[PDB]
Design a protein around this motif. Structure first.
Motif, PDB file in Angstrom:
ATOM      1  N   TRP A  10       0.822  -1.200   0.000  1.00 48.78           N
ATOM      2  CA  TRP A  10       0.000   0.000   0.000  1.00 48.78           C
ATOM      3  C   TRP A  10       0.861   1.257   0.000  1.00 48.78           C
ATOM      4  CZ3 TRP A  10      -5.045  -0.062  -0.988  1.00 48.78           C
ATOM      5  CH2 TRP A  10      -5.784  -1.206  -0.716  1.00 48.78           C
ATOM      6  N   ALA A  11       0.387   2.280  -0.718  1.00 48.17           N
ATOM      7  CA  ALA A  11       0.992   3.603  -0.687  1.00 48.17           C
ATOM      8  C   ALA A  11       0.633   4.297   0.625  1.00 48.17           C
ATOM      9  CB  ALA A  11       0.527   4.402  -1.881  1.00 48.17           C
ATOM     10  N   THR A  12       1.516   5.194   1.079  1.00 50.43           N
ATOM     11  CA  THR A  12       1.414   5.778   2.407  1.00 50.43           C
ATOM     12  C   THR A  12       0.693   7.132   2.412  1.00 50.43           C
ATOM     13  OG1 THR A  12       3.583   6.540   1.979  1.00 50.43           O
ATOM     14  CG2 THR A  12       3.408   4.585   3.409  1.00 50.43           C
ATOM     15  N   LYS A  13       0.620   7.828   1.265  1.00 50.31           N
ATOM     16  CA  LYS A  13       0.053   9.172   1.234  1.00 50.31           C
ATOM     17  C   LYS A  13      -1.151   9.272   0.301  1.00 50.31           C
ATOM     18  CE  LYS A  13       2.764  11.354   4.170  1.00 50.31           C
ATOM     19  NZ  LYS A  13       2.295  11.753   5.498  1.00 50.31           N
ATOM     20  N   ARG A  14      -1.596   8.140  -0.250  1.00 50.24           N
ATOM     21  CA  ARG A  14      -2.868   8.066  -0.947  1.00 50.24           C
ATOM     22  C   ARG A  14      -3.419   6.661  -0.746  1.00 50.24           C
ATOM     23  NH1 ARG A  14      -6.454  10.469  -3.893  1.00 50.24           N
ATOM     24  NH2 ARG A  14      -7.301   9.753  -5.893  1.00 50.24           N
ATOM     25  N   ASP A  15      -4.305   6.547   0.248  1.00 49.78           N
ATOM     26  CA  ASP A  15      -4.809   5.276   0.747  1.00 49.78           C
ATOM     27  C   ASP A  15      -5.195   4.318  -0.375  1.00 49.78           C
ATOM     28  OD1 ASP A  15      -4.520   6.270   3.371  1.00 49.78           O
ATOM     29  OD2 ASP A  15      -6.693   6.575   3.667  1.00 49.78           O
ATOM     30  N   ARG A  16      -5.741   4.869  -1.471  1.00 50.73           N
ATOM     31  CA  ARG A  16      -6.365   4.080  -2.517  1.00 50.73           C
ATOM     32  C   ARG A  16      -5.336   3.396  -3.427  1.00 50.73           C
ATOM     33  N   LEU A  17      -4.061   3.823  -3.385  1.00 53.00           N
ATOM     34  CA  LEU A  17      -3.060   3.337  -4.327  1.00 53.00           C
ATOM     35  C   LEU A  17      -2.349   2.097  -3.779  1.00 53.00           C
ATOM     36  CD1 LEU A  17      -1.378   6.557  -5.819  1.00 53.00           C
ATOM     37  CD2 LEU A  17      -3.442   5.306  -6.515  1.00 53.00           C
ATOM     38  N   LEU A  18      -2.156   1.115  -4.662  1.00 53.76           N
ATOM     39  CA  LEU A  18      -1.532  -0.151  -4.339  1.00 53.76           C
ATOM     40  C   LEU A  18      -0.403  -0.428  -5.328  1.00 53.76           C
ATOM     41  CD1 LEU A  18      -1.733  -2.613  -2.548  1.00 53.76           C
ATOM     42  CD2 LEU A  18      -3.252  -3.643  -4.239  1.00 53.76           C
ATOM     43  N   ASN A  63      -5.040   0.308 -13.637  1.00 53.99           N
ATOM     44  CA  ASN A  63      -3.618   0.568 -13.480  1.00 53.99           C
ATOM     45  C   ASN A  63      -3.279   1.987 -13.928  1.00 53.99           C
ATOM     46  OD1 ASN A  63      -2.896  -2.173 -12.619  1.00 53.99           O
ATOM     47  ND2 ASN A  63      -3.549  -2.700 -14.699  1.00 53.99           N
ATOM     48  N   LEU A  64      -2.695   2.784 -13.024  1.00 51.31           N
ATOM     49  CA  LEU A  64      -2.218   4.117 -13.352  1.00 51.31           C
ATOM     50  C   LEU A  64      -0.931   4.037 -14.170  1.00 51.31           C
ATOM     51  CD1 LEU A  64      -2.976   6.194 -10.146  1.00 51.31           C
ATOM     52  CD2 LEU A  64      -4.483   5.374 -11.991  1.00 51.31           C
ATOM     53  N   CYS A  65      -0.058   3.068 -13.874  1.00 49.38           N
ATOM     54  CA  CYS A  65       1.076   2.796 -14.746  1.00 49.38           C
ATOM     55  C   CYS A  65       1.670   1.428 -14.447  1.00 49.38           C
ATOM     56  CB  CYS A  65       2.149   3.876 -14.675  1.00 49.38           C
ATOM     57  SG  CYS A  65       2.740   4.231 -13.000  1.00 49.38           S
ATOM     58  N   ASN A 111       6.832   8.914   4.016  1.00 46.54           N
ATOM     59  CA  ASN A 111       6.545  10.263   3.541  1.00 46.54           C
ATOM     60  C   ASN A 111       5.959  10.221   2.134  1.00 46.54           C
ATOM     61  OD1 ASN A 111       8.642   9.844   1.779  1.00 46.54           O
ATOM     62  ND2 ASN A 111       9.857  11.607   2.449  1.00 46.54           N
ATOM     63  N   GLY A 112       5.937   9.032   1.515  1.00 50.75           N
ATOM     64  CA  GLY A 112       5.223   8.857   0.259  1.00 50.75           C
ATOM     65  C   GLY A 112       6.065   9.197  -0.974  1.00 50.75           C
ATOM     66  N   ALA A 113       7.257   9.771  -0.780  1.00 44.15           N
ATOM     67  CA  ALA A 113       8.053  10.286  -1.886  1.00 44.15           C
ATOM     68  C   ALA A 113       8.878   9.197  -2.596  1.00 44.15           C
ATOM     69  CB  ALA A 113       8.935  11.407  -1.365  1.00 44.15           C
ATOM     70  N   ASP A 156      11.526   6.976  -7.307  1.00 42.78           N
ATOM     71  CA  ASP A 156      10.857   8.231  -7.006  1.00 42.78           C
ATOM     72  C   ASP A 156       9.367   8.057  -7.310  1.00 42.78           C
ATOM     73  OD1 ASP A 156      11.007  11.361  -6.685  1.00 42.78           O
ATOM     74  OD2 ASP A 156      10.054  11.032  -8.630  1.00 42.78           O
ATOM     75  N   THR A 157       8.490   8.304  -6.323  1.00 40.57           N
ATOM     76  CA  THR A 157       7.065   8.023  -6.481  1.00 40.57           C
ATOM     77  C   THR A 157       6.373   9.085  -7.335  1.00 40.57           C
ATOM     78  OG1 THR A 157       6.493   9.193  -4.530  1.00 40.57           O
ATOM     79  CG2 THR A 157       6.924   6.781  -4.272  1.00 40.57           C
ATOM     80  N   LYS A 158       6.850  10.329  -7.328  1.00 40.59           N
ATOM     81  CA  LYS A 158       6.244  11.372  -8.145  1.00 40.59           C
ATOM     82  C   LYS A 158       6.431  11.060  -9.633  1.00 40.59           C
ATOM     83  N   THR A 159       7.609  10.556 -10.049  1.00 45.23           N
ATOM     84  CA  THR A 159       7.851  10.246 -11.459  1.00 45.23           C
ATOM     85  C   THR A 159       7.609   8.771 -11.760  1.00 45.23           C
ATOM     86  OG1 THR A 159      10.198   9.949 -11.044  1.00 45.23           O
ATOM     87  CG2 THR A 159       9.507  12.141 -11.806  1.00 45.23           C
TER      88      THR A 159
HETATM   89  O1  LIG Z   1       0.325   8.525  -7.976  1.00 42.52           O
HETATM   90  C1  LIG Z   1       1.488   8.686  -8.327  1.00 42.52           C
HETATM   91  N1  LIG Z   1       2.471   8.912  -7.448  1.00 42.52           N
HETATM   92  C2  LIG Z   1       2.256   8.942  -6.007  1.00 42.52           C
HETATM   93  C3  LIG Z   1       3.063  10.120  -5.458  1.00 42.52           C
HETATM   94  C4  LIG Z   1       2.480  10.754  -4.196  1.00 42.52           C
HETATM   95  C5  LIG Z   1       2.668   9.942  -2.931  1.00 42.52           C
HETATM   96  S1  LIG Z   1       1.725   8.435  -2.927  1.00 42.52           S
HETATM   97  O2  LIG Z   1       0.444   8.702  -3.510  1.00 42.52           O
HETATM   98  O3  LIG Z   1       1.763   7.907  -1.587  1.00 42.52           O
HETATM   99  C6  LIG Z   1       2.545   7.320  -4.014  1.00 42.52           C
HETATM  100  C7  LIG Z   1       2.964   6.103  -3.489  1.00 42.52           C
HETATM  101  C8  LIG Z   1       3.446   5.128  -4.346  1.00 42.52           C
HETATM  102  C9  LIG Z   1       3.514   5.371  -5.702  1.00 42.52           C
HETATM  103  C10 LIG Z   1       3.096   6.589  -6.214  1.00 42.52           C
HETATM  104  C11 LIG Z   1       2.607   7.595  -5.384  1.00 42.52           C
HETATM  105  C12 LIG Z   1       1.885   8.653  -9.776  1.00 42.52           C
HETATM  106  C13 LIG Z   1       3.102   9.248 -10.147  1.00 42.52           C
HETATM  107  C14 LIG Z   1       3.547   9.195 -11.435  1.00 42.52           C
HETATM  108  C15 LIG Z   1       2.789   8.544 -12.427  1.00 42.52           C
HETATM  109  N2  LIG Z   1       3.261   8.484 -13.709  1.00 42.52           N
HETATM  110  C16 LIG Z   1       2.487   7.822 -14.580  1.00 42.52           C
HETATM  111  O4  LIG Z   1       2.932   7.682 -15.813  1.00 42.52           O
HETATM  112  C17 LIG Z   1       1.274   7.231 -14.224  1.00 42.52           C
HETATM  113  N3  LIG Z   1       0.808   7.282 -12.994  1.00 42.52           N
HETATM  114  C18 LIG Z   1       1.567   7.947 -12.070  1.00 42.52           C
HETATM  115  C19 LIG Z   1       1.124   8.012 -10.729  1.00 42.52           C
END
Ligand SMILES: O=C(N[C@@H]1CCCS(=O)(=O)c2ccccc21)c1ccc2nc(O)cnc2c1
Length: 337
Positions: free
Chosen positions: A65-73, A92-94, A113-115, A139-142
């Motif tokens: 699970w992601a730490t800064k957006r509950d819904r992301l796995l 799937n987002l990516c 910290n989610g980064a 890097d989670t942002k990219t």
């Molecule tokens: O949600 C995205 N990142 C977040 C970053 C904020 C912290 S978090 O939400 O806890 C986290 C935790 C784990 C992974 C990603 C994220 C993300 C970024 C880049 C992407 N690039 C694409 O091409 C497609 N989808 C993309 C989706």
């Protein structure tokens, strides 16, 4: 009675042995994965219901699970990919490929910290798990890889990963039985030691972060001094059904599962520890002087070996997951007295 059992329900939508089951960061959702690549996302409070279900074409080995957006796995495949799954949007987002020779994504850890996140990526098992592997920082942002940590003395499959509370440390256990603690600011191994004879299966920081706990193929549960490399604080031989290999035996045919998911989990303050057994979760009190660890609570309810567990607290109420080789997941609610 240091806990009261408010009840025990069963989530039974998986038809194959459970690989992983983890509660999300909100403490409201479960992501479970079986050995047929079926991923389920479900709530349980106040009832069980399924929010998402899917068969993976690719083998799936890890989940986090992601730490800064509950819904992301995060999901790690057996084909060298990491995919980000939105459990709300159910898509799937990516999906990023690991441009390497290491297809088995054995472990995923998201930083508090989610980064950033880390994954381990290992070569195929031998026709043993004593094979090369890497450890990747992302890097989670990219969703791009940033670096990989060199492993001493040799590349090796890392089975388990955990961050401390701030995210400045990462502890790992590997197939060579060695624990490696990474400084995540300097990106170097601060400390490593031989922990187990055979593989390390699970690692965790104590609540106070003066020790790390590990469990390994030799059936030992050990607590290590984080300030002095390889110095034991305590050591216990758990029942062999805590570490497997886990066997479900008609006749002739048997199913055999080596530890892959989390073998131990802790209450919110790190005073109690849930472990696997043939018939259910078994909870121990930590910090005792006793030379043999005595069970303080047995949650029971299983007719096949438990192979992975989790323990989450939210709304000042504990939820224990025990998952067995028949695919059943018992969800036991505990309040602390
Ligand atoms: O949600 C995205 N990142 C977040 C970053 C904020 C912290 S978090 O939400 O806890 C986290 C935790 C784990 C992974 C990603 C994220 C993300 C970024 C880049 C992407 N690039 C694409 O091409 C497609 N989808 C993309 C989706």
């Amino acid at each position: 009675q240091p806990f009261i059992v408010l009840g025990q329900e069963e989530y039974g939508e998986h038809h194959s042995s459970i690989m992983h089951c983890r509660v999300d960061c909100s403490g409201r959702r479960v992501a479970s994965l079986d050995v047929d690549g079926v991923i389920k996302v479900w709530s349980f409070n106040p009832i069980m219901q399924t929010k998402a279900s899917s068969i993976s074409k690719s083998p799936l080995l890890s989940l986090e699970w992601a730490t800064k957006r509950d819904r992301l796995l995060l999901l790690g495949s057996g084909v060298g990919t990491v995919r980000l799954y939105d459990t709300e949007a159910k898509k799937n987002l990516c999906e990023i490929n690991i441009n390497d020779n290491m297809p088995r994504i054995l472990s995923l850890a998201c930083s508090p910290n989610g980064a950033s996140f880390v994954c381990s990526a290992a070569a195929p098992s031998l026709t043993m798990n004593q094979v090369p592997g890497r450890l990747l920082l992302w890097d989670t942002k990219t969703m791009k890889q940033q670096l990989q940590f060199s492993l001493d003395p040799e590349p090796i499959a890392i089975n388990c990963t955990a961050f401390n509370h701030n995210g400045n440390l990462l502890v790992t256990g590997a197939a060579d039985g060695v624990i490696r603690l990474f400084d995540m600011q300097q990106h170097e191994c601060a400390m490593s030691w031989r922990a187990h004879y055979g593989e390390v299966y699970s690692v965790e920081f104590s609540y106070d972060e003066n020790t790390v706990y590990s469990i390994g193929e030799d059936g030992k549960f050990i607590q290590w001094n984080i300030h002095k490399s390889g110095l034991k604080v305590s050591e216990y031989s758990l029942p062999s059904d805590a570490t497997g290999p886990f066997v479900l035996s008609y006749s002739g045919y048997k199913q055999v599962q080596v530890p892959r998911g989390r073998l131990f989990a802790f209450d919110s303050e790190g005073n109690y520890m849930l472990t696997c057994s043939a018939t259910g979760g078994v909870i121990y009190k930590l910090g005792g002087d006793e030379k043999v660890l005595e069970s303080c609570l047995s949650l029971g309810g299983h007719r096949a070996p438990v192979v992975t567990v989790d323990w989450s607290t939210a709304m000042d109420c504990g939820t224990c997951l025990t998952a067995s080789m028949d695919g059943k997941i018992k969800l036991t609610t505990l309040l602390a007295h």
